[PDB]
């Protein structure tokens, strides 16, 4: 009855989870304070300055030694993640567990790594990195700032996550006392921030698509832009859809579509014959090839 | 007139207050201006029901000159402008700004 | 409104808009904006002067 019920009803969901959206920051590397800076209160007063005493969150790490490390989705505000991540610890730790995917389990010690199987483990970790980054860069509400440090452009206010707002736009820093951070941030170009352009199709509606600049690494950006490119590849116009449905019913039940603006639809519902052939063959390989298997079919 | 005088590229109106500092208003910013003017009028003349709200609640408040039109299948467009008649409050208001 | 503290007993300096530290003493012109963002320092290093 299980097989028969399975073969008879296709409305059993179990479809691949295609639509995943991120409203946070399209980055996978986190700037990290590794070695904290010392607090001086008797001698050498004034050599260091913390943004804490100004009630401000520094846009950059301010420890004695700072590092760039790979941490997937560390700023991923929004939808729930794919469910697999890559989180390297700072280089002051082992960071070996990230390379024991294969050929390690019963063989090497807990505190080692397999030097003879390095290539495979590295490849798999990169694969996990890639899969974890497959999201859609969703837009979010923009707004102008009425403060003094405005640049004339609107920015993306991360309501409920103010620390994101501080991190997103290093250009909006407030700089006293010319520290090494200040000596760099002071060179920031004024208007390289916030919304750059948008596609405003319907009056009073949310922009269908927007272009802006913010904190975002190139590699993750390249990944996600490919991901949407893939999604577009499996989408067709409603006219195609209705024609396909009509044909499937041997031109019985000839329905049609309304004619009006459909601004930002997306129907990833199609593929190529080669994929269909591939899946068909693969499905046959999965099942047994005896008379007891084709009978429910 | 009020919205036009706060976006320094907008619909053409005399601008006596341009000497004052003002960041150029976005679509959202102008809505607040539209609301305040709306409320002030309804308070002054004691009016119930909508008077000007649609301009603030939907679409871009940065209006220039209202117009309605219909499109014929033959590609012909029939458009009817509705330029307002001579206002009186606007004149004295501009005078108040100038002085 | 960045100031530049200096070691070895040299008294501090202020960043000219040409991006060159200058001595505090003398004459200065403050746009409203820089004051609004650097009042905390101004209250401690310029105002006393």
């Amino acid at each position: 009855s299980k097989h028969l019920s399975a073969y008879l009803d296709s409305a059993v969901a179990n479809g691949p989870e295609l639509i995943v959206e991120d409203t946070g920051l399209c980055t996978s590397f986190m700037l990290l304070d590794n070695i904290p800076s010392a607090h001086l209160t008797k001698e050498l007063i004034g050599f260091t300055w913390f943004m804490q005493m100004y009630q401000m969150t520094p846009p950059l790490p301010e420890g004695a030694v700072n590092r760039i490390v790979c941490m997937t989705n560390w700023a991923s505000l929004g939808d729930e993640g794919r469910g697999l991540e890559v989180r390297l610890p700072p280089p002051t730790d082992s960071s070996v567990h990230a390379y024991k995917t294969v050929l390690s389990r019963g063989y090497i010690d807990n505190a080692q790594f397999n030097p003879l199987a390095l290539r495979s483990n590295v490849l798999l970790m990169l694969l996990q990195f890639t899969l974890s980054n497959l999201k859609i860069n969703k837009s979010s509400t923009f707004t102008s700032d009425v403060t003094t440090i405005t640049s004339g452009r609107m920015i993306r206010a991360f309501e409920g996550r103010p620390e994101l707002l501080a991190l997103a736009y290093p250009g909006r820093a407030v700089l006293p006392t010319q520290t090494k951070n200040a000596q760099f941030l002071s060179t920031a170009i004024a208007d390289r921030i916030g919304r750059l352009d948008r596609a405003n199709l319907i009056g009073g509606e949310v922009s269908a698509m927007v272009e802006c600049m913010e904190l975002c690494d190139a590699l993750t950006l390249h990944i996600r832009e490919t991901y949407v490119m893939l999604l577009r590849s499996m989408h067709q116009d409603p006219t195609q859809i209705v024609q396909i449905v009509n044909e499937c019913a041997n031109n019985l039940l000839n329905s049609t579509i309304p004619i009006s603006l459909r601004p930002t639809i997306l129907c990833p519902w199609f593929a190529s014959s080669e994929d269909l052939r591939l899946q068909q063959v693969m499905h046959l390989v999965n099942i047994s090839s005896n008379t007891a298997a084709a009978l429910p079919l | 007139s009020a919205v036009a005088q706060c976006q320094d590229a907008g619909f053409l109106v005399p601008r006596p207050l341009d000497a004052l500092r003002q960041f150029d208003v976005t679509s959202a910013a102008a809505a607040e201006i539209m609301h305040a003017v709306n409320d002030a009028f309804k308070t002054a003349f004691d009016l119930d029901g909508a008077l000007l709200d649609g301009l603030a609640l939907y679409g871009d408040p940065r209006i220039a000159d209202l117009s309605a039109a219909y499109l014929q299948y033959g590609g012909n467009v029939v458009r009817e402008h509705v330029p307002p008649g001579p206002s009186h409050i606007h004149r004295t208001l501009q005078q108040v700004e100038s002085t | 409104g960045t100031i530049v503290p200096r070691p070895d007993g040299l008294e501090p300096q202020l960043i000219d808009d040409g991006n060159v530290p200058r001595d505090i003493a003398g004459d200065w012109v403050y746009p409203s904006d820089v004051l609004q963002v650097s009042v905390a320092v101004f209250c401690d290093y310029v105002w006393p002067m």
């Binding site: 707004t143 309501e159 | 409320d39 | 009042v39 209250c43």
Partner: peptide
């Protein structure tokens, strides 16, 4: 009374996010 209305939350959020302290206690203040 005079008319006022609150700004939109997004405006307020950004404004409140940037408010450095007016007076800061440091040992070197002339």
């Amino acid at each position: 009374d005079i008319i006022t209305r609150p700004t939109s939350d997004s405006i307020a959020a950004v404004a409140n996010a940037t408010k450095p302290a007016a007076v800061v206690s440091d040992p070197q203040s002339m």
